[PDB]
Amino acid sequence: TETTIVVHYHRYDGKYDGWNLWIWPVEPVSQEGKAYQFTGEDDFGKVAVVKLPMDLTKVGIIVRLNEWQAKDVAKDRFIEIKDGKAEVWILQGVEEIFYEKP
Amino acid sequence: FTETTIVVHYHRYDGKYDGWNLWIWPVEPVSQEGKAYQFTGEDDFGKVAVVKLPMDLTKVGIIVRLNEWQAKDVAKDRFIEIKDGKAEVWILQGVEEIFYEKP
Ligand SMILES: OC[C@H]1O[C@H](O[C@H]2[C@H](O)[C@@H](O)[C@@H](O[C@H]3[C@H](O)[C@@H](O)[C@@H](O[C@H]4[C@H](O)[C@@H](O)[C@@H](O)O[C@@H]4CO)O[C@@H]3CO)O[C@@H]2CO)[C@H](O)[C@@H](O)[C@@H]1O
Ligand SMILES: OC[C@H]1O[C@H](O[C@H]2[C@H](O)[C@@H](O)[C@@H](O[C@H]3[C@H](O)[C@@H](O)[C@@H](O[C@H]4[C@H](O)[C@@H](O)[C@@H](O)O[C@@H]4CO)O[C@@H]3CO)O[C@@H]2CO)[C@H](O)[C@@H](O)[C@@H]1O
């Protein structure tokens, strides 16, 4: 009844203040998104544990600065989800979203 | 012409740059055994090497290695495609894709 997405984010400039995640359901339903904040950190960068109150197989994600001051990769990207859980790694300026730790 | 210059930018998310260097070998138009090249500089993205080879090359191989082959950062051979004897690339720890503009 929920989808949990752990998002790892690394910026080579070390300047994470204000960066947050705009995530929206896409399948099996499309709905307007919400902003999610980073909740922790590890050796790769910031960590967000995102909980969405539906079972989802795909979401959209944009890494954004404050309220749309900038987009780190300014196009919609997607995360494929199995059994209500995914974990991804995202790097500043790199379009590809990784499903294993670099 | 008669030399090839490759500027190689390297970023590690863990900051553990100590010992890392570049193994580069000519591949086209003629293949030869490689050589190690050290980083000489640094910028906001991380380490920088300027690699000069005394031939006009359209393709080189590259491996990012720790000292004398103690480890590789991405273990498979990778290649850089070069036009008119000059190229510049950006390499990220653990990321296979070599980038041709700054992330
Ligand atoms: O089912 C809901 C909708 O879902 C999908 O919409 C996505 C977009 O595709 C994403 O790009 C994003 O939209 C962001 C947008 O990227 C961002 O620039 C900002 O856009 C605002 C803008 O700041 C504002 O000034 C105003 O002019 O409107 C803009 C909207 O374009 O904020 C957007 C979020 O509000 O996320 C949405 C989902 O939230 C889907 O593709 C749509 O078909 C669908 O309606
Ligand atoms: O002359 C053209 C040759 O070019 C190509 O050879 C390449 C390889 O494909 C690359 O992988 C690399 O080789 C490295 C190798 O990756 C690395 O592991 C290391 O291997 C050592 C090892 O540490 C050591 O313990 C012992 O086993 O010796 C090994 C080498 O036999 O070092 C290699 C380089 O010395 O670079 C070369 C070019 O230098 C092409 O594939 C060949 O067919 C071609 O002959």
Are B46 and A12 an interchain contact pair (Cβ–Cβ within 8 Å)? yes
Q: What domain count does chain B have?
A: 1
Question: What ligand 2 atom has the least distance to the C-alpha of B23?
Answer: 36
Omega before A53 cis (within 30°)?
no
Are B103 and A93 an interchain contact pair (Cβ–Cβ within 8 Å)? yes
Taking contacts as CB-CB distances below 8 angstroms, the residues of chain A near B94 are: 101-102
Ligand 1: residue whose CA is nearest its atom 19: A68
**In chain A, what's the furthest Cα-to-Cα distance?**
38
Taking contacts as CB-CB distances below 8 angstroms, the residues of chain B near A98 are: 95
* A46 strand-pairing partners: A9, A41
**Closest approach of chain B CAs to the CA of A18, in angstroms?**
19
Tell me the C-alpha to C-alpha distance, in Å, between residue A30 and each of A4, A5, A53, A83, B69.
17, 17, 13, 18, 49
Domain around A73: 1-102
Instruction: Report CA(A22)–ligand 1 centroid distance (Å).
Output: 10
Give me the resolution in angstroms, 1 decimal. Answer: 1.5
Ligand 1: residue whose CA is nearest its atom 17: A68
Per DSSP, the residues of A61-91 read: EEEEETTTTEEEEEEEEEEE-BTTEEEEEEE
Q: How far apart are CA B58 and CA B70, in angstroms?
A: 29
Please choose, from the candidates A4, A36, A2, A34, the residue with its C-alpha nearest in 3D space to the C-alpha of residue A19.
Answer: A36
CATH, residue B83? 2.60.40.1110
